[PDB]
Amino acid sequence: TNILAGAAVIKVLEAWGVDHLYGIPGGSINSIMDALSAERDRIHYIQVRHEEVGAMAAAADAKLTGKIGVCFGSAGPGGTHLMNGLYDAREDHVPVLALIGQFGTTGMNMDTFQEMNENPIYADVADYNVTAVNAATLPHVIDEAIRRAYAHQGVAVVQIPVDLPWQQIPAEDWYASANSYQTPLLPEPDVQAVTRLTQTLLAAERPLIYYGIGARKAGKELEQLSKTLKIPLMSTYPAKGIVADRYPAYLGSANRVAQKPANEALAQADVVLFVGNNYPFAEVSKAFKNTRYFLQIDIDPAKLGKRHKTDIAVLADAQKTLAAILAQVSERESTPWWQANLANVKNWRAYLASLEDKQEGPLQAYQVLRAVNKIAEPDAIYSIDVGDINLNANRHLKLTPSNRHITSNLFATMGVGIPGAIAAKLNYPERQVFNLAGDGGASMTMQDLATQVQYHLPVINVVFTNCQYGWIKDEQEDTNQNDFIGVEFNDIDFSKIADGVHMQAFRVNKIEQLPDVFEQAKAIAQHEPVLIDAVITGDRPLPAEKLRLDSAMSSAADIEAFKQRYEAQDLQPLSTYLKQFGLDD
Amino acid sequence: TNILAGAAVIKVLEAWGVDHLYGIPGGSINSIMDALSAERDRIHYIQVRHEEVGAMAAAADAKLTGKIGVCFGSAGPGGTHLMNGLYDAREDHVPVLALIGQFGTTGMNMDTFQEMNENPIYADVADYNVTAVNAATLPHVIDEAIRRAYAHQGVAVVQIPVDLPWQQIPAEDWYASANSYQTPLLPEPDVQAVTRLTQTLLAAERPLIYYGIGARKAGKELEQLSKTLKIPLMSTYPAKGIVADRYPAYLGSANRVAQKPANEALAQADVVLFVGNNYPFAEVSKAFKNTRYFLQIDIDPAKLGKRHKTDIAVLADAQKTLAAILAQVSERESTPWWQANLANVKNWRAYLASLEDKQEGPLQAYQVLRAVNKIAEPDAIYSIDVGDINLNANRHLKLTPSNRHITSNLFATMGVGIPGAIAAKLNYPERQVFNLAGDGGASMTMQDLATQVQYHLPVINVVFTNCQYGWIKDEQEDTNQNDFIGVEFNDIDFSKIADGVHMQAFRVNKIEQLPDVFEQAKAIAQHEPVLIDAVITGDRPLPAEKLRLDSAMSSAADIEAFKQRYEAQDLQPLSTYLKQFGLDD
Amino acid sequence: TNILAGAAVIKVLEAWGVDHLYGIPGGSINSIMDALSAERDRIHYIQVRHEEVGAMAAAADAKLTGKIGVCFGSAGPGGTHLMNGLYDAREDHVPVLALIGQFGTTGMNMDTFQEMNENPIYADVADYNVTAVNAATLPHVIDEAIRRAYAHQGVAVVQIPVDLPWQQIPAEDWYASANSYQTPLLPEPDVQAVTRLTQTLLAAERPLIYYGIGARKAGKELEQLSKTLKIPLMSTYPAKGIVADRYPAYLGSANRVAQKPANEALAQADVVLFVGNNYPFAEVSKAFKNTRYFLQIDIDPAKLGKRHKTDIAVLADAQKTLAAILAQVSERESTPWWQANLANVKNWRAYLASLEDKQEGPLQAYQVLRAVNKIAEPDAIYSIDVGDINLNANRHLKLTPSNRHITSNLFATMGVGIPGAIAAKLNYPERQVFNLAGDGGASMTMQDLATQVQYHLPVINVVFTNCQYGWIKDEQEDTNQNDFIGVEFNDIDFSKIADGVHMQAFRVNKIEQLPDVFEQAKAIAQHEPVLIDAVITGDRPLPAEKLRLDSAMSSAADIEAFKQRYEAQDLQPLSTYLKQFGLDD
Ligand SMILES: Cc1cc2nc3c(=O)[nH]c(=O)nc-3n(C[C@H](O)[C@H](O)[C@H](O)COP(=O)(O)OP(=O)(O)OC[C@H]3O[C@@H](n4cnc5c(N)ncnc54)[C@H](O)[C@@H]3O)c2cc1C
Ligand SMILES: Cc1cc2nc3c(=O)[nH]c(=O)nc-3n(C[C@H](O)[C@H](O)[C@H](O)COP(=O)(O)OP(=O)(O)OC[C@H]3O[C@@H](n4cnc5c(N)ncnc54)[C@H](O)[C@@H]3O)c2cc1C
Ligand SMILES: Cc1cc2nc3c(=O)[nH]c(=O)nc-3n(C[C@H](O)[C@H](O)[C@H](O)COP(=O)(O)OP(=O)(O)OC[C@H]3O[C@@H](n4cnc5c(N)ncnc54)[C@H](O)[C@@H]3O)c2cc1C
Ligand SMILES: Cc1ncc(C[n+]2c([C@@](C)(O)C(=O)O)sc(CCOP(=O)(O)OP(=O)(O)O)c2C)c(N)n1
C-alpha cells in the first residue's frame, strides 16, 4: 500500500544491480542510512574513514566493472569531501552516483546548522545535479540520475533533504528503469573509409599503431596486425596490458610515464594510426609534428580530428574496425623499420632487467617492482597511486590481457591507491589485488587502511618511501631557479601506521630483504590485508622525454652525464639500430 | 608566414561551412568584427537590433538545417542578452556557438569598464564554456567548441579577450577538424526484441503509435504501419507534419497544445508504441496511468524507461526499427477501436472546419489561420511564437512532410517568431516563410522586424492581436481565486510598428477583410517582407484537456456551457463512437 | 488562524515599503499573481512588455530612491530575460529583489514543460540565490532576501515553486524584519589623518579634488573647499550635478565620457584628493601615472588603495571628512594653477555653447540637448541610455544638486533609457522626466514605450537617430584595419513606433524645427508621454581622450584636421593657459 521513500530509493539501487556503496553517516543523511540498514542482505554498505575514499572507490568500481559506482556524504563537509573522487570520475569518464545530505525542507534556507544551498557546490563536476524537493518523485530522481550517469559516462549528484526518505509514498507508483538498459548494436565500420585508411597505413615506410583504452576489446587484433604487417605498437600509459608487455614489438608509452622506444619511434614515424586514443600531450608536446599522415579510429564524434590534423578519421568501434583491417591484409616480410624497433626494444628491456636484477645493496624502486612481479598472480589487479610509481609500474610491471590496472588517469589525484584496491577486492574477492603507492599519496588516504582491515579485504599494499614528492622534485630540478621547496620531507613509518590500524606489515630498506618479505606478504594476503613499506633511494628514474644518447643530437659531455646518472651506459639510441638496418633519421 | 588569430578563427568557421552569423558589435568584440569585415565575400554577418534575436536565429538555423548556428554579443550586456536563445538551443538540443566579447588580457581582473569574470555567466547553459587566454590556440578552441556543440547537441560558449584576435600567429600551425566531422552512428534494432515488440503491439485491443521528432525520418513507415495494422497515430506537437495532417487516422497531439481525439484515445489505450518521443507532460499529466504495456524505441539510452516503465525497450534508430516491424507484418482487418477513432477524427475536423469557414463577422484566430492556409505554398516554412498560436497553428495548419515548422519547444521563450523567420528565409530564400506570433511575443522582439527590412527577407508576418496574454489569462481562469492580473493590456498597432521600420503592412479586424489582404501579402512577399496585424476576439480556444461533452462524466449544465462557449454543439465525446462499435468507455 | 503563504509574502513586501513592482505573469508564477491581485489597493503591479525592462526599472527605482526595487519573471525565459537589469543592479550596487517562477514541487526534476534547475542560472549575478522548498518559511526567505539585498547593496533572487504560495500557513508565525532595518554606520575621519591629508593637499603645486558619487551628500563642502583653497574640481561622469555644472572651476569628467579640461588637468596634477570614487579607467588609462601624492577618502575598505597606491587613506564618510578639512583651513590666494584651469574651462564652455547656439541647418545632437535645456525644469530627472548620449549629455546638460540623472554606469547595458524613465515617473510623478536615448538603445526596449502609455507616465522621450551605433563606429575608426562593419544600419522612424503604441510624437531633422516641437512636447508631458525622434548627423563628437591642439605634441596637419572635423578652431590646449600664468607643461 505505502512504502517509505527511502526504502524505494534503495530498491532503485538494487534494481540497477548496485552491490556496494560507500559513505559516512550524519544527521543530514540518517534517513537514507535508515533505509540501507533494513537492506543489509541485498546491498552492502561500506563505512569508509574519509568520504574522499568512498568517492574514489566508487569511481574505481566503475573503472573496473563498467557498472555505476555509488557514494554519499552528509550535508556540507561530508559532500565536499567527495570532490577528489567525483572529479576523478568526471575526468576518467565513468558513471558515479553521489548522494549528498541536506537539512530537512522545513529548515532549508533558514541559515541553520550545517545548512547551505548545496546545489552550486556540485554544478561544475556533475553531468546531473539536482536538489530533491518531493518524496513521491525521489525514486524517479534517483533512477534519472543513474540513467544519465551511464548514458553520459559521468557524475550524477542528488542533494536529499533528510525529511523526504522518511515520508510514506504509494507503494505502486515508483519504478526503476534498469530493465530498459542495453548497449547499442552498431553498423559495421564504414567499408570504403576503412579500405582507404588501410592503404595509407600500408604505403608508409615507418608506420606505428598508437592505441589507447578505446581499443581495450581489440588486444588480439592489435597484436596480429602488428605481427602480420610488421608495424610496431605503442599505447597510452593506461592502455598498458591490452597487448601483453612481453610482446617483442610493443614499444611502451610516450612522453613521461613512458618508455624510451615509444618516444624515439614516434619522432621518426611517417604514418600513425591513432585508435581509441585521447592522449592529452599530443599538442603540447608536439608529438606528431613530423608525422606525414595521421589516421584515426574513434567511437566518439567529439574526438574526430581532435588531437592532430587528421587525414582519415573513421567513426567506428575500434575492435570491429581493426578486425575489418586484418581481414583485408596479409603477410608482409620483415622491414628495416621493424627490425630496428625490435632491436631497440630488446636493448631497453635489458636496461630495465639490469635495474631489476641487482641482488643486494640500497633498495631502489626497480627491485621493489621486480619483487611484486615475482609474487603476482597472472590475473592480479593493480590499483596505482600518482607520482613516480606511474612511471616505474609502467616500465616494470609485466602485464597481460588477464590483468587490470587503474589509476587517476587525467585528474591524477594522489590518494587513489588505497580506495582503488578496496574497490578491486570488493568486486573480485578471488583475485589478487595490489595497492602500489608513493609515500606522499599513501599518506593522503592512509586512514582507510583501517577500511581494508574492517572489511577483511586482503590487499597487498606496497608503499614506496623516498621521503619526497619525487615526481615534483624532478620537475623543480628541470624548471626552478631556486632551491628545492616542499618536495623533501620527514619519514613516516607505514609499517607502524599499519600496526595502528591492526594490519600486518613489514619495513624493508635493502634489496636482499625483498624475497622473504614478499613471500610472507603473498601468504598473509590469502586471508588478510598486508603492507610492505619499501624505503627506497632518491635516484631519479631515466627521463624518456629527455634522452641524451644520440651523438648527432647531444654533445658527448651530455651523453656521458646522462649515462652516468641513469646507469644507462649500455643503452643505444634508436639511430644506432636504424643505421644498422640501413635507414637514416 | 603569419596570420592574425582573428583571421584564422574566421577561416575555422568557413571550414565548418558557416554561411551566416548574428550579433551586434562593441569595443570588446571589434577584433572579431575586423576579421569578419575582411571575409565578407565568404561569410555573411547579419547585424540584429537586439542580441537575443541573434541567439534565437542561431538556434533556429540549427533546428532548420542541422548545421551549427553562430551568434555573438559584446562583453557584459551583449552576451547576457543572448541568454534566451542559448537556453532555447540547450533545451531544444541543437548546436550553437556563441562568441562573447571580453576586455583585453592586460585589463582583465582590473575591474575596468564593462569588465567582469564572464565565465560563470555561461556555466549553466553551456556544454562547453571557456575563456580563451592565448592567440595561437584560439583557432583550436573555436574548432573544439564547434566539434563539441555538434557531438553533444548543445551550446558552446567562448569568451574572447579582444587583444587575442589582433595578434599574429604562425600561418601554418592552425587547422579545422571540419574535414573529419561525422554524425553519431545509428544503432540497429535487435531482431528478437522487434519481434517481441510487434507481437505485443498486435495483441493489443486498443493500440496507439505515439511518436515525436525522433521519428522525423520515418513518416512513410509510420503512415504505412498505421494503415496496414489499423492502428491510430498520435504525435507530440513538434512532430506535427511528419505524417500529413490529412491522414484520417492522425489524432493530433495530447495535453494542451493538443487535439481532442489524441487526448481521448490516449486515456483508453492499452498499448502505446512510444517512438522518438520525450513528451514532457507524461508523468505530470498521468498520461499513461491506465496503459497496460509500454513499448519504447529511442536512440538515446538516457531516454529508455524515462517517461514510463518499459515492457520492451529498443535502443535503435526510429526509421530502421519501424521498417523492421513493417517488414514482418501484413494487412490486418478493421477493428472496433480503429473505426471508433476514425469517426472521432471526422467529427473533430468538421468542428475545426466550421470555425475556419465563417465568412463575415468579428475576426477570430481560426479564420486568420484558414487565410494563411489559402495562400500557403506546399513547402512553406512556419516560424511560430509562444502562446495561443501554438494551439491554434497545431489545430489549423494543414502540413505535410514538405513543410517545416519550428518554435521554442521546451524552454518555450516568447519572441522566437521573428528570429526563426529570419533564419528560415536566410536558409531557404526560395521557400515561403511565415512568422505566426501573438501580440505579447511579437512585442518582445518587434525591433527586429527592421532586420527583415534591412536584409530584404520576404517574411509574411502575422500578428494575432488580442490585447492579452491569452495563454496566461486562460490559466488564471483555471487556477486563480482573485481577479485577472497582468493578462489584459493596451493595444499596439503592429501595422504602424511595421510602417516605422519601413515594412508594408495591413491591419484587419473582420473576417470578410482577409481574402484580399492575404492575397496582397502573398504578392508583396515575392520580394519584400510584409506584416498583417489581425485584431482578434478574446474567445478562449477549446481546451482539449478540459472537455465537457460526456454525460457520464460531466453535468448537463457544464456540457451546455462548454458547447456554447466553444461553438462545439456538433462535437461528440469519443465514448459515443466507442459505443457505436460495441466497446465500452 | 491561517493565511495563504502568497498573501504573507505580499505582506512582507508591504512591510518593507514596496510601492510598485514589475513583471509579466506565467503559469509558473500565477500564485504570486493571485496574491498581488488581492493586494492591488496597497501594492502596485506594473506589467511591462519585456521582463528586462521590469528588471532595469527595478534597478532604477533603487538608484533613484535608495529603496529596494522588485521584479519578477516566470519560469525559464521570463527569469532569463531579467538578466541585463540584474547585472545592472549588481554592477551599480543597488538593492533589487527578483522573484523567479518555478514548476510546483510535485513536478520539479521530472523534466516537464519549461522546468529546469533554475538555481545555477542566477548564481553569478546574485548576492543571495535560493530555491524556496517550504510554504511556512517562504515569508522568512523573502524577508531574508530583502534584508541581504539592502545590507549587501546587490541582487537577491528567490525561485518559487508555484504550489507554495497557494498553501495555507499559520497566520501568526510569519513576520517581516522591516521594522528593525537600519542603514550601515557612517565611520568618522581620524583627526590626525585628516590633518596630514590637509597639509599634503595645501603643499601641492597642482592640486585636484576628484570625486565620485560617494560624495553625493557633500556638494556644498566640495564647492566650498574648491573656492576657499583655489583647487579645481573634477568628477566621475555619474557624479556630474553634485556640484552645479555652472561652477567655474568644475572641469568635468576624465577619459571618454569626458570634458577636455578634466583630461588635461589630470595629466598635470601633482596631488589628487580621490573621494567617494571608484573610476574604473584609473589603471587601464594610466590616469595617475605622473601623480606625486594620492589621497583617498572612501567608506569601503575594499576600495582603499585599489585604483592607485595611497599616501594618505581615510576610511570615513565623504561629507564628514570634507567638512573636517574645510573646518581647519582658511581662504588662500589665487595661484597660477588655479587661473590656468579657470581660463581653460571658459574656453571649453564657449566651444560647447558655439555648438548649442546654431540656429538653422542640419540637426546635430548638440542643438537637441540645448532644446532639452530650454524646456527643462530645475528639478528635472534624466534617464539616459548608453552610447554617444552619455558623452553628449555629460557635456551639454546644465545640472545642479536639484537634478537627478541615472544610466547603467558600469555594466553599461543599452536599453535603460525607457525603463529608467518609467521608474523615475513612478517615483516622482510631479517632477519632469526625460528619456534621452540613441536609436540603437531605444530600439532594444522600444516596446515598453507602450508601458508609459498604459500607465499614463508623462515621460519626454528623445531619440537621437543617427542610423548608427555611433559609439562603436568611432571605436572601429580608432582600432580597426578593415572597413566599418555592423555600425551603420537602416532607419527606424520612432515617431511611427510611438504612433503604434498610441503615444503623441514628432520627428525633426533641422535645427530650426526644435523650439516649436520642444514647446509642444513640454506641454503634452503635463499629462501624457511624448516622443521626439531627432534625426541627427553622423558627426563624431570631439574625443577628449584624443586631443590634437598642442603643437608641442601634434603635427600641424593633425591639428588642422581636428579643428575642422570638430568645429574646434577656437579651442586652445591647456598648455596655452599654463604658459600665460608662468607654468610649463
Ligand atoms: C602522473 C601521471 C602522468 C601521466 N603522464 C602520461 C604520459 O606521460 N604518457 C601517457 O601515455 N599517459 C600519461 N598519463 C595518462 C594520461 O593523462 C591520459 O589519461 C592517457 O594518456 C589517455 O589514455 P587513453 O587515450 O587510453 O584514454 P582516454 O583519454 O579515456 O581516451 C579513450 C579514447 O577512446 C575512445 N573510445 C572509447 N571506446 C571506444 C571504442 N569502442 N572504439 C573506439 N574508440 C573508443 C574515446 O572516445 C576516447 O577518445 C599520466 C597519468 C598520470 C596519473
Ligand atoms: C506554449 C507551448 C506549449 C506546449 N505544450 C505541449 C503540449 O500540450 N503537447 C505537446 O505534445 N507538446 C507541447 N509542447 C511541446 C513540448 O514542450 C515538447 O517539446 C514536445 O512535446 C516533445 O516533443 P518530441 O518528443 O517530439 O521532441 P524531443 O523532446 O526533442 O524528443 C525527441 C526524442 O527522439 C529521440 N531521437 C532523436 N533521434 C532519434 C532517432 N533517429 N531514432 C529514435 N529516436 C530518436 C531523442 O532521443 C528524444 O528522446 C509545447 C510547446 C509550447 C511552445
Ligand atoms: C557608455 C559609458 C561610458 C563611460 N565612460 C566613462 C568615462 O569615460 N568617464 C567616467 O568618469 N565615467 C564613465 N563611465 C561611468 C563609469 O563606468 C563608472 O561607473 C564611473 O566612472 C564610476 O563613478 P563613481 O566612482 O562616482 O561611482 P562608483 O563606482 O559607484 O563608486 C562610488 C564610490 O564611493 C564610495 N562611497 C559610497 N558612499 C560613500 C560615502 N558616504 N563616503 C565616501 N565614499 C563613499 C564607494 O565605496 C565607491 O568606492 C561610463 C558610463 C557609460 C554608460
Ligand atoms: C591531491 C594532489 N595534490 C598534489 C598533486 C601534484 N602532484 C603530482 C602531479 C602528477 O599532479 C604533478 O603535479 O605533476 S605527483 C605528486 C607527488 C607524489 O608524491 P609521492 O610521494 O606519492 O610519489 P613519488 O613521486 O614516488 O615520491 C604531486 C604532489 C596531485 N596530483 N594530487
Ligand SMILES: Cc1ncc(C[n+]2c([C@@](C)(O)C(=O)O)sc(CCOP(=O)(O)OP(=O)(O)O)c2C)c(N)n1
Ligand atoms: C519570455 C517569456 N516570458 C513569459 C513567458 C510565460 N508565457 C507563456 C508560457 C507558455 O511560458 C506559460 O507561462 O504558460 S505563454 C505567454 C503569453 C503569450 O502571449 P501572446 O500575446 O504572445 O499570445 P496569446 O496567447 O495569443 O495572447 C507567457 C507570457 C514566456 N514563455 N516567455
Ligand SMILES: Cc1ncc(C[n+]2c([C@@](C)(O)C(=O)O)sc(CCOP(=O)(O)OP(=O)(O)O)c2C)c(N)n1
Ligand atoms: C545590450 C548591449 N549590447 C551591446 C553593447 C555595446 N555598445 C556600447 C558599449 C559602451 O558597451 C561599448 O561596446 O563600447 S555603445 C553601443 C552603441 C549604442 O548605439 P546607439 O545608437 O544607442 O547610440 P549612438 O552612439 O548615439 O549611435 C554598443 C552597441 C552594449 N553596451 N549593450
Ligand SMILES: [Mg+2]
Ligand atoms: Mg614519495
Ligand SMILES: [Mg+2]
Ligand atoms: Mg496576445
Ligand SMILES: [Mg+2]
Ligand atoms: Mg545611434
Ligand code: NA
Ligand atoms: Na525588445
